[PDB]
């Protein structure tokens, strides 16, 4: 409900660098093992399912991503509108592209 | 010619507004510059802080209203532009500092 | 002379990966509807994963400059927790789409969602199959097709098998669900190719001169 | 040199497992030997009610998953670190047939 | 209520510093990493559920599956289970 | 429904640059945040 900005930035960066996010359907207390952020917290701190789930709800509502639920897993993908939005929250300059376009093969 | 820099700062929330927050930020000694209001009803909110800053790098913009939107603190449409809704701040403090051309 | 607590790792390292494949089947089916998705396969090469796809028109899923594919690869890896760039993918193209039940039934679903009547859609599907060289196709459309009191009317053309082990080789079946304003419209397809691949249907004898 | 290496291959269907066997035996005759051991079949059994609701005659499904396993540990010292690779890439790349190598 | 203490007699009798046995079930490492927060979900307990439909009843744990019997007949052919004999 | 009260001048613990409040931060004292 009260989400730190480090978390927002972390989620956005994870999206851009991976263009995706596959997330569990969970509502109890727990910590996501993937996306991590540092706020003087040990070496790194992991977030909580609640914050990230609220974030993702909002994003998909705005049209940034498109879900594709499955065996009780959330599969999100960022679109073009989303790219044209993530590119400015992170302060990215124009022309920059995410890694999957970087000829993985 | 100073607005150009603040835009990135607020994205990391460096700019800080409010009497109960500006006070504490400077008293910890972690501030670069501070600003004021063109005026205000009571000196206290103005003349109390000014000494606390001189005694412990100030400016003053005759438009106290610019200090509101320059520090975010504005409502805009989902489609860019803006609501023309501005809360009139009165003091701001730069922590991270993350302008140099003007000084 | 041997311990049974150790090989359980080999046996349990096969089961997990068979399951991992099914989730992908579901996900692709819910995703690559427009690319003529049919099936999937996997190869657990230690260094990296390889997945082989069967799609009518891969260039759609390929994406300009291979963007959709790459967007997919990074995604799966996070879920199955593999280092991306070791989660590569390959796509293969089906040439006899009329022999594939999935393509047919998905096309039928599309055509139905455009309001066209069932009588035309089914028989267009069936003509398409026969042109492909098939010995039979049966279509079924059950649900609230009229005002109320749902009924099933089935269309067919040729000859079909219905029992025996041979039905697991020469008979290809599939189903879907179609959500509409009245309700849900169940649809299913089945096609019979006796001369498929190289296997020979039993009780089939050819003589000489 | 000599590393006592062992080859284990696992599959659920009996037709490729025997085909993979032949290719390997063909390609390992020189780099030492490669005679197989056929293990007892691990058969997984699951019995389920054929009904989702529990009505009518109590009728049961009987699934199973046979898993076949073969083990060529005959390389032994007859294969070096790179020599194992040679054949393993010269054998066919059947889509599904798990393989693991250990000394 | 940090300024709340108890007699020493009522302290050694307290449960030894041991991790409550109930560990829950994490089908995958992804699905976790260890005001109302004081009692949101303190009743830790096994919550094993189908990895397809999420139901807590009739779950085959045998072989490390974790699939409901109903949610099973459908996907069994894909997995490789077949009906013979 | 806590019975809070409203004050606009949350800034007069001190007179002029003073140290009234027991960096920064009857029954004795009860410090903000933890004890």
Coordinates of C-alpha atoms in Angstrom, one line a residue:
Chain A
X1 CA 0.0 0.0 0.0
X2 CA 2.9 2.3 0.8
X3 CA 5.6 1.3 -1.7
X4 CA 9.2 2.7 -1.7
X5 CA 10.4 4.2 -4.9
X6 CA 13.5 2.0 -5.0
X7 CA 11.0 -0.8 -5.6
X8 CA 9.3 1.0 -8.5
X9 CA 12.6 1.6 -10.2
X10 CA 13.7 -1.9 -9.6
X11 CA 10.6 -3.4 -11.2
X12 CA 10.9 -1.1 -14.2
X13 CA 14.5 -1.9 -14.7
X14 CA 13.9 -5.6 -14.5
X15 CA 11.2 -5.2 -17.1
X16 CA 13.4 -3.3 -19.5
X17 CA 16.4 -5.5 -19.1
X18 CA 14.2 -8.6 -19.5
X19 CA 11.1 -7.2 -21.3
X20 CA 9.0 -9.5 -19.1
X21 CA 8.1 -10.8 -15.7
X22 CA 6.6 -14.2 -14.8
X23 CA 5.1 -13.9 -11.3
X24 CA 3.4 -16.3 -8.9
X25 CA -0.2 -16.0 -7.9
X26 CA 0.3 -15.4 -4.2
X27 CA -1.1 -13.2 -1.5
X28 CA 0.5 -14.5 1.7
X29 CA 3.7 -12.9 3.1
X30 CA 6.8 -13.7 1.1
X31 CA 9.7 -12.2 -0.7
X32 CA 10.3 -12.4 -4.4
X33 CA 13.6 -14.2 -5.2
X34 CA 14.2 -12.5 -8.6
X35 CA 14.1 -8.7 -8.6
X36 CA 16.2 -7.2 -5.9
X37 CA 17.0 -3.7 -4.8
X38 CA 19.6 -2.1 -2.6
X39 CA 18.6 0.6 -0.1
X40 CA 21.5 0.2 2.3
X41 CA 19.8 -3.1 3.1
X42 CA 22.5 -5.6 3.7
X43 CA 24.0 -6.2 0.2
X44 CA 20.6 -6.2 -1.5
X45 CA 17.0 -6.5 -0.3
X46 CA 14.2 -8.4 -2.0
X47 CA 10.7 -7.1 -2.1
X48 CA 7.4 -8.5 -1.0
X49 CA 4.7 -10.1 -3.2
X50 CA 2.1 -7.5 -2.1
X51 CA 3.9 -4.4 -3.4
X52 CA 4.8 -5.9 -6.7
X53 CA 1.4 -7.4 -7.3
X54 CA -0.3 -4.0 -6.7
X55 CA 2.3 -2.4 -9.1
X56 CA 1.6 -5.0 -11.8
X57 CA -2.1 -4.6 -11.5
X58 CA -1.8 -0.9 -12.1
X59 CA 0.6 -1.3 -15.0
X60 CA -1.6 -3.7 -16.8
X61 CA -4.6 -1.5 -16.2
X62 CA -2.8 1.4 -17.9
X63 CA -2.1 -0.8 -21.0
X64 CA 1.6 -1.2 -20.4
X65 CA 1.6 -5.0 -20.3
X66 CA -0.6 -7.9 -21.4
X67 CA -1.2 -10.9 -19.1
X68 CA -1.4 -14.5 -20.2
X69 CA -2.2 -16.5 -17.1
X70 CA -1.6 -20.2 -16.9
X71 CA -0.8 -22.9 -14.4
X72 CA -1.4 -20.4 -11.7
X73 CA 1.4 -18.1 -12.9
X74 CA 1.3 -14.6 -14.1
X75 CA 3.0 -13.9 -17.4
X76 CA 3.4 -10.3 -18.4
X77 CA 5.0 -8.7 -21.4
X78 CA 5.6 -5.0 -22.1
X79 CA 4.3 -3.5 -25.2
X80 CA 5.3 -0.5 -27.3
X81 CA 3.3 2.0 -25.3
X82 CA 4.9 0.6 -22.2
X83 CA 8.4 1.0 -23.7
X84 CA 7.5 4.6 -24.5
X85 CA 6.7 5.0 -20.8
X86 CA 9.4 3.0 -19.1
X87 CA 12.0 4.9 -21.1
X88 CA 11.4 8.1 -19.1
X89 CA 10.8 6.9 -15.6
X90 CA 14.3 5.4 -15.7
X91 CA 15.5 8.6 -17.4
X92 CA 16.5 6.6 -20.4
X93 CA 17.5 8.5 -23.5
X94 CA 15.7 8.0 -26.8
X95 CA 16.9 5.3 -29.1
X96 CA 17.9 2.9 -26.4
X97 CA 16.5 -0.6 -26.7
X98 CA 16.1 -3.6 -24.4
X99 CA 18.4 -6.5 -24.3
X100 CA 16.2 -9.1 -26.1
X101 CA 16.6 -7.0 -29.2
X102 CA 20.4 -7.4 -28.7
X103 CA 20.6 -10.4 -30.9
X104 CA 20.6 -13.0 -28.1
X105 CA 21.2 -15.6 -30.9
Chain B
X1 CA 17.7 29.6 -16.3
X2 CA 17.6 27.0 -13.5
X3 CA 14.5 24.8 -14.0
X4 CA 16.3 22.5 -16.4
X5 CA 18.0 20.6 -13.6
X6 CA 15.3 19.9 -11.0
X7 CA 13.4 17.5 -13.3
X8 CA 15.7 14.6 -12.7
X9 CA 16.2 15.4 -9.0
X10 CA 12.5 14.9 -8.1
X11 CA 12.5 11.6 -9.9
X12 CA 14.7 10.5 -7.0
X13 CA 12.8 12.8 -4.6
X14 CA 15.8 15.1 -3.7
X15 CA 13.6 18.2 -3.5
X16 CA 11.9 18.3 -0.1
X17 CA 9.0 20.6 0.8
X18 CA 7.3 21.4 4.1
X19 CA 8.1 23.1 7.4
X20 CA 8.4 19.9 9.4
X21 CA 10.6 18.3 6.8
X22 CA 12.9 21.1 5.8
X23 CA 13.8 21.9 9.4
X24 CA 14.9 18.3 10.1
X25 CA 16.9 18.0 6.9
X26 CA 19.1 20.9 7.5
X27 CA 19.6 20.2 11.2
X28 CA 21.2 16.9 10.2
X29 CA 23.7 18.9 8.0
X30 CA 23.1 17.3 4.6
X31 CA 21.8 20.1 2.5
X32 CA 23.2 22.1 -0.4
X33 CA 20.9 25.1 -0.9
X34 CA 17.5 26.2 0.3
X35 CA 14.7 28.5 -0.8
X36 CA 12.0 30.7 0.7
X37 CA 8.7 32.5 0.0
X38 CA 8.3 35.9 -1.6
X39 CA 6.4 36.6 1.7
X40 CA 4.3 34.9 4.3
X41 CA 1.9 35.9 7.1
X42 CA 4.4 35.3 9.9
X43 CA 8.1 35.9 10.0
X44 CA 8.5 32.9 12.2
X45 CA 8.2 30.5 9.3
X46 CA 10.6 32.8 7.4
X47 CA 12.8 34.5 9.9
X48 CA 13.2 31.4 12.1
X49 CA 14.6 29.3 9.3
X50 CA 16.7 32.0 7.8
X51 CA 18.9 32.3 10.9
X52 CA 19.0 28.5 11.3
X53 CA 20.4 28.4 7.8
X54 CA 22.8 31.3 8.0
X55 CA 23.8 30.1 11.4
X56 CA 23.7 26.6 10.0
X57 CA 23.6 29.3 1.3
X58 CA 20.2 30.8 0.6
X59 CA 18.2 32.2 -2.3
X60 CA 14.8 33.9 -2.9
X61 CA 12.5 33.9 -5.9
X62 CA 9.9 36.7 -5.9
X63 CA 7.5 34.2 -7.3
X64 CA 6.6 31.8 -4.5
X65 CA 4.3 30.1 -7.0
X66 CA 7.1 28.8 -9.2
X67 CA 8.4 27.0 -6.2
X68 CA 5.3 24.8 -6.2
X69 CA 5.4 23.2 -9.7
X70 CA 9.2 23.4 -10.0
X71 CA 9.1 20.8 -7.2
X72 CA 6.7 18.5 -8.9
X73 CA 3.7 19.0 -6.6
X74 CA 1.4 19.3 -9.6
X75 CA -1.5 17.3 -11.1
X76 CA -1.5 16.6 -14.8
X77 CA -3.6 14.7 -17.3
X78 CA -2.7 11.1 -18.2
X79 CA -2.1 12.7 -21.7
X80 CA 0.7 15.2 -20.8
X81 CA 0.1 18.9 -20.4
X82 CA -1.3 19.5 -17.0
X83 CA -4.3 20.3 -14.7
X84 CA -2.9 23.7 -14.0
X85 CA -3.2 22.6 -10.4
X86 CA -0.3 23.8 -8.3
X87 CA 0.1 23.7 -4.5
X88 CA 2.0 26.9 -3.4
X89 CA 5.1 25.6 -1.6
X90 CA 7.3 27.9 0.5
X91 CA 10.7 26.2 1.1
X92 CA 12.7 23.4 -0.5
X93 CA 16.0 21.7 0.2
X94 CA 18.4 19.8 -2.0
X95 CA 19.9 16.7 -0.5
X96 CA 21.4 14.4 -3.1
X97 CA 22.1 17.3 -5.5
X98 CA 22.4 14.6 -8.2
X99 CA 22.5 25.4 -11.6
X100 CA 26.2 24.3 -11.7
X101 CA 26.0 26.4 -14.8
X102 CA 24.3 29.3 -13.1
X103 CA 26.8 29.1 -10.2
Chain C
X1 CA 24.6 -54.5 -4.8
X2 CA 23.0 -51.2 -5.9
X3 CA 21.3 -48.4 -4.0
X4 CA 17.8 -47.2 -5.1
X5 CA 18.1 -43.8 -3.4
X6 CA 20.5 -42.5 -6.0
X7 CA 18.9 -43.2 -9.4
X8 CA 15.8 -41.5 -8.0
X9 CA 17.6 -38.3 -9.1
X10 CA 17.7 -39.4 -12.7
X11 CA 14.1 -40.5 -12.6
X12 CA 12.9 -37.4 -10.8
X13 CA 15.0 -35.2 -13.2
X14 CA 12.9 -36.5 -16.1
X15 CA 9.5 -36.2 -14.6
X16 CA 10.0 -32.5 -13.7
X17 CA 10.9 -31.7 -17.2
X18 CA 8.0 -33.6 -18.7
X19 CA 5.7 -31.4 -16.5
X20 CA 7.6 -28.3 -17.5
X21 CA 6.6 -29.1 -21.1
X22 CA 2.9 -29.2 -20.4
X23 CA 2.8 -25.7 -18.9
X24 CA 4.4 -24.5 -22.1
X25 CA 1.8 -26.2 -24.1
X26 CA -0.9 -24.4 -22.2
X27 CA 0.9 -21.1 -22.3
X28 CA 1.5 -21.2 -26.1
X29 CA -2.1 -22.4 -26.7
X30 CA -3.3 -19.3 -24.7
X31 CA -0.8 -17.1 -26.5
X32 CA 0.2 -18.1 -30.1
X33 CA -3.3 -18.5 -31.3
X34 CA -2.7 -16.4 -34.4
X35 CA 0.5 -18.2 -35.4
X36 CA -1.1 -21.6 -36.1
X37 CA 0.3 -23.1 -32.9
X38 CA 0.0 -26.8 -32.7
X39 CA 2.5 -28.5 -30.4
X40 CA 5.9 -28.2 -28.6
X41 CA 8.9 -30.3 -27.7
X42 CA 12.0 -29.9 -25.4
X43 CA 15.6 -30.9 -25.2
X44 CA 17.3 -30.5 -21.8
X45 CA 20.8 -29.9 -23.1
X46 CA 22.8 -29.1 -20.0
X47 CA 24.3 -25.9 -21.2
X48 CA 21.1 -24.5 -22.5
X49 CA 17.5 -25.3 -23.3
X50 CA 16.0 -25.8 -26.8
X51 CA 12.3 -25.7 -27.7
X52 CA 10.9 -26.7 -31.1
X53 CA 7.6 -25.2 -32.2
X54 CA 5.1 -26.2 -34.9
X55 CA 3.3 -23.2 -36.4
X56 CA 1.5 -22.6 -39.6
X57 CA 3.1 -19.2 -40.2
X58 CA 6.2 -18.8 -38.0
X59 CA 7.1 -15.4 -39.3
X60 CA 4.3 -14.0 -37.2
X61 CA 5.8 -15.5 -34.0
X62 CA 9.3 -14.9 -35.4
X63 CA 8.5 -11.2 -35.3
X64 CA 10.3 -8.5 -37.1
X65 CA 14.0 -9.1 -36.5
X66 CA 13.1 -11.9 -34.0
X67 CA 11.6 -9.6 -31.4
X68 CA 8.6 -11.6 -30.1
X69 CA 10.7 -14.8 -29.9
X70 CA 13.4 -13.1 -27.9
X71 CA 10.9 -11.3 -25.7
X72 CA 9.5 -14.8 -25.0
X73 CA 12.9 -16.4 -24.2
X74 CA 13.8 -14.0 -21.5
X75 CA 10.4 -14.5 -20.0
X76 CA 10.4 -18.3 -19.7
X77 CA 13.8 -18.2 -18.1
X78 CA 12.7 -16.2 -15.2
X79 CA 9.9 -18.5 -14.5
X80 CA 11.9 -21.7 -14.8
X81 CA 14.9 -19.9 -13.4
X82 CA 17.5 -20.5 -16.1
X83 CA 20.2 -18.1 -17.2
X84 CA 18.8 -16.3 -20.3
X85 CA 20.7 -16.8 -23.5
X86 CA 20.7 -20.5 -22.4
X87 CA 17.0 -20.6 -23.1
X88 CA 17.0 -20.5 -26.9
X89 CA 14.1 -21.4 -29.2
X90 CA 13.5 -22.8 -32.7
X91 CA 10.4 -22.9 -34.8
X92 CA 9.3 -25.4 -37.4
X93 CA 6.6 -25.1 -40.0
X94 CA 3.6 -27.4 -40.7
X95 CA 2.9 -28.0 -44.4
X96 CA -0.2 -30.2 -44.2
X97 CA -2.4 -27.9 -42.1
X98 CA -5.4 -29.9 -43.2
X99 CA -4.2 -33.0 -41.5
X100 CA -3.7 -31.1 -38.2
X101 CA -6.8 -30.9 -36.1
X102 CA -5.7 -28.0 -34.0
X103 CA -5.3 -25.6 -36.9
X104 CA -8.7 -26.6 -38.2
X105 CA -10.5 -26.2 -35.0
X106 CA -8.9 -22.9 -34.2
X107 CA -9.8 -21.6 -37.6
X108 CA -13.3 -22.7 -37.0
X109 CA -13.4 -20.8 -33.7
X110 CA -12.3 -17.7 -35.5
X111 CA -14.9 -18.0 -38.1
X112 CA -17.6 -18.6 -35.5
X113 CA -16.6 -15.6 -33.5
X114 CA -17.4 -13.5 -36.7
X115 CA -21.0 -14.6 -36.5
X116 CA -21.0 -16.8 -39.6
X117 CA -23.4 -19.8 -39.4
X118 CA -22.2 -23.2 -38.4
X119 CA -23.4 -25.0 -41.5
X120 CA -20.9 -23.2 -43.7
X121 CA -18.0 -23.2 -41.4
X122 CA -18.0 -26.9 -40.8
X123 CA -18.3 -27.9 -44.4
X124 CA -15.6 -25.5 -45.4
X125 CA -13.3 -27.1 -42.8
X126 CA -14.2 -30.5 -44.2
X127 CA -13.6 -29.6 -47.8
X128 CA -10.2 -28.2 -46.7
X129 CA -9.3 -31.5 -45.1
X130 CA -10.4 -33.7 -48.0
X131 CA -8.4 -31.6 -50.4
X132 CA -5.4 -32.4 -48.2
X133 CA -5.9 -36.1 -48.7
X134 CA -8.0 -37.5 -45.8
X135 CA -10.4 -40.3 -45.4
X136 CA -12.8 -38.5 -43.1
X137 CA -13.6 -35.6 -40.9
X138 CA -16.3 -35.1 -38.3
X139 CA -17.3 -31.8 -36.7
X140 CA -19.6 -31.2 -33.8
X141 CA -21.1 -28.0 -32.3
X142 CA -23.0 -28.4 -29.1
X143 CA -24.6 -25.7 -27.0
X144 CA -27.4 -23.1 -27.0
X145 CA -27.3 -22.7 -30.8
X146 CA -30.9 -21.5 -30.9
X147 CA -33.1 -19.7 -28.4
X148 CA -32.8 -22.2 -25.6
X149 CA -32.8 -26.0 -25.0
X150 CA -29.2 -26.7 -26.2
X151 CA -28.7 -29.4 -28.8
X152 CA -25.8 -30.9 -30.7
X153 CA -25.9 -31.2 -34.5
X154 CA -22.9 -33.0 -36.0
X155 CA -21.6 -32.8 -39.5
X156 CA -19.4 -35.5 -41.3
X157 CA -18.4 -36.6 -44.7
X158 CA -16.3 -39.7 -45.0
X159 CA -15.5 -42.8 -43.0
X160 CA -14.1 -42.8 -39.5
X161 CA -12.7 -45.1 -36.9
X162 CA -14.0 -45.0 -33.3
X163 CA -12.5 -47.9 -31.4
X164 CA -9.3 -49.9 -31.0
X165 CA -5.6 -49.1 -30.5
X166 CA -5.4 -47.7 -34.1
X167 CA -7.4 -44.7 -32.9
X168 CA -4.3 -43.5 -31.1
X169 CA -2.3 -43.2 -34.4
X170 CA -4.6 -42.5 -37.3
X171 CA -7.3 -40.5 -35.4
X172 CA -6.4 -36.9 -34.5
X173 CA -8.8 -35.1 -32.2
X174 CA -9.1 -31.7 -30.5
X175 CA -11.6 -29.5 -28.7
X176 CA -12.2 -25.9 -27.7
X177 CA -14.6 -23.7 -25.8
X178 CA -16.2 -20.6 -27.3
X179 CA -17.6 -17.9 -24.9
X180 CA -20.5 -16.0 -26.3
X181 CA -23.4 -13.9 -25.1
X182 CA -25.9 -16.7 -24.9
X183 CA -23.4 -19.0 -23.3
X184 CA -20.6 -21.5 -24.1
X185 CA -20.4 -23.3 -27.5
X186 CA -18.5 -26.6 -27.4
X187 CA -16.8 -27.6 -30.5
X188 CA -14.6 -30.6 -31.4
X189 CA -12.9 -32.1 -34.4
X190 CA -11.5 -35.4 -35.5
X191 CA -9.7 -36.5 -38.6
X192 CA -8.7 -39.9 -40.0
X193 CA -5.6 -40.4 -42.0
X194 CA -5.0 -44.1 -42.5
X195 CA -2.0 -43.8 -44.8
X196 CA -0.2 -41.5 -42.3
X197 CA 3.5 -41.7 -41.9
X198 CA 4.7 -45.2 -42.7
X199 CA 2.7 -47.4 -40.4
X200 CA 0.1 -49.7 -42.0
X201 CA -3.4 -50.0 -40.6
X202 CA -4.1 -53.6 -39.7
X203 CA -6.8 -55.8 -41.3
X204 CA -5.7 -54.2 -44.5
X205 CA -4.3 -56.7 -47.1
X206 CA -2.9 -56.0 -50.5
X207 CA -2.5 -58.7 -53.1
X208 CA -0.4 -59.3 -56.2
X209 CA -1.0 -60.3 -59.8
Chain D
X1 CA 43.5 -39.9 -20.3
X2 CA 41.5 -42.2 -18.0
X3 CA 38.5 -41.0 -16.1
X4 CA 36.3 -44.0 -15.5
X5 CA 33.4 -42.2 -17.3
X6 CA 29.9 -43.5 -17.3
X7 CA 27.0 -42.9 -19.7
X8 CA 23.4 -43.0 -18.5
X9 CA 20.4 -42.4 -20.8
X10 CA 16.7 -42.4 -19.8
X11 CA 13.5 -42.4 -21.8
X12 CA 9.8 -43.1 -21.5
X13 CA 9.3 -44.8 -24.9
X14 CA 11.1 -47.9 -25.8
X15 CA 11.7 -47.2 -29.5
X16 CA 14.1 -44.3 -29.4
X17 CA 16.0 -45.7 -26.4
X18 CA 16.8 -48.8 -28.5
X19 CA 17.7 -46.6 -31.4
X20 CA 20.0 -44.4 -29.4
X21 CA 21.6 -47.5 -28.0
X22 CA 22.5 -48.7 -31.5
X23 CA 24.0 -45.4 -32.6
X24 CA 26.1 -45.2 -29.5
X25 CA 27.4 -48.8 -29.8
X26 CA 28.3 -48.0 -33.4
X27 CA 30.1 -44.8 -32.4
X28 CA 31.9 -46.2 -29.4
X29 CA 33.5 -49.4 -30.7
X30 CA 36.8 -47.6 -31.1
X31 CA 37.0 -45.3 -28.1
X32 CA 37.0 -48.4 -26.1
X33 CA 33.8 -50.4 -25.7
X34 CA 30.2 -49.6 -24.8
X35 CA 28.1 -52.6 -23.9
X36 CA 24.7 -51.9 -22.3
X37 CA 23.0 -52.8 -19.0
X38 CA 19.2 -53.0 -19.1
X39 CA 17.7 -52.0 -15.8
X40 CA 14.4 -53.2 -14.3
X41 CA 11.6 -51.0 -15.6
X42 CA 10.5 -48.4 -13.2
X43 CA 6.7 -48.2 -13.7
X44 CA 4.8 -45.3 -12.2
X45 CA 1.2 -46.2 -11.3
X46 CA -1.7 -43.9 -10.6
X47 CA -5.3 -45.1 -10.0
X48 CA -8.0 -42.5 -10.3
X49 CA -11.8 -42.4 -10.2
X50 CA -13.1 -42.0 -13.7
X51 CA -15.8 -39.6 -12.4
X52 CA -15.3 -36.0 -11.2
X53 CA -18.4 -36.2 -8.9
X54 CA -18.7 -39.7 -7.6
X55 CA -21.8 -41.0 -9.2
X56 CA -22.8 -44.4 -10.7
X57 CA -20.7 -47.5 -10.8
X58 CA -17.3 -47.1 -9.1
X59 CA -15.1 -47.3 -12.2
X60 CA -11.4 -46.7 -12.2
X61 CA -8.7 -45.5 -14.5
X62 CA -5.3 -47.2 -14.6
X63 CA -2.5 -45.0 -15.9
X64 CA 1.2 -45.7 -15.8
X65 CA 4.5 -44.3 -17.0
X66 CA 7.2 -46.8 -17.9
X67 CA 10.7 -45.4 -17.7
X68 CA 13.5 -47.3 -19.4
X69 CA 17.2 -46.8 -18.5
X70 CA 20.4 -48.0 -20.0
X71 CA 23.9 -47.5 -18.7
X72 CA 27.1 -47.6 -20.7
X73 CA 30.0 -47.2 -18.2
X74 CA 32.3 -49.0 -20.5
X75 CA 34.3 -46.0 -21.7
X76 CA 36.2 -46.0 -18.4
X77 CA 39.8 -45.1 -19.1
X78 CA 39.1 -45.6 -22.8
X79 CA 37.8 -42.1 -23.2
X80 CA 39.4 -38.7 -22.5
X81 CA 37.6 -35.5 -21.6
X82 CA 37.3 -34.4 -25.2
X83 CA 36.9 -37.9 -26.6
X84 CA 33.5 -38.3 -24.8
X85 CA 32.3 -35.3 -26.8
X86 CA 33.3 -36.7 -30.2
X87 CA 30.7 -39.5 -30.2
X88 CA 28.1 -37.7 -28.1
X89 CA 27.7 -35.1 -30.9
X90 CA 28.1 -37.7 -33.7
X91 CA 25.2 -39.7 -32.3
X92 CA 21.7 -38.5 -33.4
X93 CA 20.1 -35.7 -31.5
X94 CA 16.8 -37.4 -30.7
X95 CA 14.5 -34.8 -29.2
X96 CA 13.8 -36.5 -25.9
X97 CA 16.3 -38.9 -24.2
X98 CA 18.0 -37.5 -21.1
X99 CA 21.7 -38.2 -20.9
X100 CA 24.2 -37.6 -18.1
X101 CA 28.0 -38.3 -17.9
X102 CA 29.9 -39.0 -14.7
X103 CA 33.4 -40.4 -14.0
Chain E
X1 CA 4.5 -2.1 24.4
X2 CA 8.2 -2.5 24.5
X3 CA 8.3 -1.6 28.2
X4 CA 6.6 -4.9 29.0
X5 CA 8.6 -7.4 31.1
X6 CA 7.8 -10.6 33.0
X7 CA 9.1 -12.3 36.1
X8 CA 12.2 -14.5 35.4
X9 CA 10.3 -17.5 36.7
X10 CA 7.9 -17.0 33.7
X11 CA 10.8 -16.8 31.3
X12 CA 12.8 -20.1 31.4
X13 CA 9.5 -22.0 30.9
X14 CA 9.1 -20.3 27.6
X15 CA 9.5 -22.5 24.5
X16 CA 13.1 -23.1 23.5
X17 CA 14.3 -21.0 20.6
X18 CA 13.2 -23.6 18.0
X19 CA 11.9 -23.0 14.5
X20 CA 8.2 -24.0 14.4
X21 CA 8.1 -27.3 12.6
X22 CA 5.2 -26.4 10.2
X23 CA 7.3 -25.3 7.1
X24 CA 4.6 -24.8 4.5
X25 CA 5.3 -26.1 1.0
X26 CA 7.2 -24.1 -1.6
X27 CA 6.5 -26.0 -4.8
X28 CA 9.2 -23.7 -6.4
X29 CA 11.9 -21.4 -5.2
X30 CA 10.2 -18.6 -7.1
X31 CA 7.0 -18.4 -5.0
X32 CA 8.7 -17.0 -1.9
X33 CA 11.9 -16.2 -0.1
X34 CA 11.3 -16.6 3.6
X35 CA -0.8 -3.0 12.5
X36 CA -2.2 -6.1 10.7
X37 CA 1.3 -7.5 9.9
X38 CA 1.5 -8.8 13.5
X39 CA -1.3 -11.3 12.7
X40 CA -1.9 -11.3 9.0
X41 CA -0.9 -14.9 8.4
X42 CA 0.8 -16.1 11.6
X43 CA -0.9 -19.5 11.5
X44 CA 1.8 -21.2 9.5
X45 CA 0.7 -24.5 8.1
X46 CA 1.2 -26.8 5.1
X47 CA -0.7 -25.3 2.2
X48 CA 0.1 -27.8 -0.4
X49 CA -2.1 -27.3 -3.5
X50 CA -2.4 -28.2 -7.1
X51 CA 0.1 -26.6 -9.4
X52 CA -2.7 -26.1 -12.0
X53 CA -6.0 -25.3 -10.3
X54 CA -5.0 -24.3 -6.8
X55 CA -7.3 -26.5 -4.8
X56 CA -6.3 -28.0 -1.5
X57 CA -8.2 -31.3 -1.8
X58 CA -7.2 -34.6 -3.3
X59 CA -3.6 -33.8 -4.3
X60 CA -1.3 -36.5 -5.4
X61 CA 2.0 -35.8 -3.7
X62 CA 3.4 -39.2 -4.9
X63 CA 6.4 -38.8 -7.1
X64 CA 6.5 -35.0 -6.4
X65 CA 3.6 -34.3 -8.6
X66 CA 1.2 -32.1 -6.7
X67 CA -1.7 -32.3 -9.1
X68 CA -5.4 -32.8 -8.2
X69 CA -7.0 -36.0 -9.4
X70 CA -9.5 -34.0 -11.5
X71 CA -6.9 -31.6 -12.9
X72 CA -4.9 -34.8 -13.9
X73 CA -6.9 -36.9 -16.4
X74 CA -6.7 -33.9 -18.8
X75 CA -3.0 -33.4 -18.8
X76 CA -2.0 -37.0 -18.3
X77 CA -1.6 -37.8 -21.9
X78 CA 0.6 -34.7 -22.5
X79 CA 2.8 -35.7 -19.5
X80 CA 3.1 -39.3 -20.8
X81 CA 0.9 -41.3 -18.6
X82 CA -1.1 -43.7 -20.8
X83 CA -3.9 -46.2 -20.2
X84 CA -3.0 -49.8 -21.1
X85 CA -3.7 -53.1 -19.4
Chain F
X1 CA -11.9 7.1 15.4
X2 CA -8.9 8.4 17.3
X3 CA -9.5 11.9 18.8
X4 CA -6.7 13.8 17.2
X5 CA -6.4 17.6 17.4
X6 CA -5.4 20.2 14.9
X7 CA -2.6 22.8 15.2
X8 CA -1.2 24.8 12.2
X9 CA 2.0 25.9 14.2
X10 CA 3.9 22.6 14.5
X11 CA 7.1 24.6 14.8
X12 CA 7.3 26.5 18.2
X13 CA 9.0 24.0 20.5
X14 CA 11.9 26.5 20.4
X15 CA 12.1 30.3 20.8
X16 CA 14.8 31.3 18.3
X17 CA 17.3 28.6 17.2
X18 CA 16.9 26.7 20.5
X19 CA 16.9 23.1 21.7
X20 CA 13.6 22.5 23.3
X21 CA 12.9 18.9 22.3
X22 CA 14.2 16.1 24.3
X23 CA 20.4 14.4 15.0
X24 CA 17.0 15.6 16.2
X25 CA 14.3 13.1 17.1
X26 CA 3.2 13.5 33.9
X27 CA 5.3 10.4 32.9
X28 CA 8.9 11.1 32.0
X29 CA 9.4 11.2 28.2
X30 CA 8.1 8.9 25.4
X31 CA 10.3 9.3 22.3
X32 CA 8.8 9.1 18.8
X33 CA 9.1 5.9 16.8
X34 CA 10.3 3.1 19.1
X35 CA 10.3 3.8 22.9

